[PDB]
């Protein structure tokens, strides 16, 4: 929940799209790079 | 995959060909298939686009 004041009212202002298969989750296989960039990643269900 | 939960997990293969038998016959309109009736209307002996 959008934890607000008691007359707050919240309006988007970009809304964006994208297909059902999609997660925000790295491969398993992000152990090590050459970039030493590496982002967190995490295990996400099966269908994406 | 369809949902993200098990309801069963036994009798799962693995590989197969499953080819959709895709009709010969096109799509035939020429007898009313695909069609609806207009809502609230008639159009008694009449042609109409
Ligand atoms: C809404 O859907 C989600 C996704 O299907 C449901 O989350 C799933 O809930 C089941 C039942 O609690 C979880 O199964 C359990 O997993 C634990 C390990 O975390 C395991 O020890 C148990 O034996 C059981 O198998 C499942 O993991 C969980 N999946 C995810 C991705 O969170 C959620 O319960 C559904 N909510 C409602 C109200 O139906």
Redesign the pocket.
């Known amino acids: 929940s959008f934890n607000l004041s008691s007359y707050d009212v919240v309006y988007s202002d970009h809304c964006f799209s994208v297909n059902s298969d999609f997660c925000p989750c790295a491969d398993p296989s992000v152990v090590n790079s050459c970039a030493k960039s590496k982002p967190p990643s995490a295990i996400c269900?099966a269908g994406t | 995959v369809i949902?993200?939960?098990?309801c069963t997990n036994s009798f799962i293969n693995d590989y197969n060909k499953t080819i959709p038998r895709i009709s010969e016959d096109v799509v035939d309109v020429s007898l009313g298939l695909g069609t609806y009736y207009v809502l609230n209307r008639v159009y008694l002996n009449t042609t109409l686009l």
């Open positions: 269900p | 949902g993200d939960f098990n």
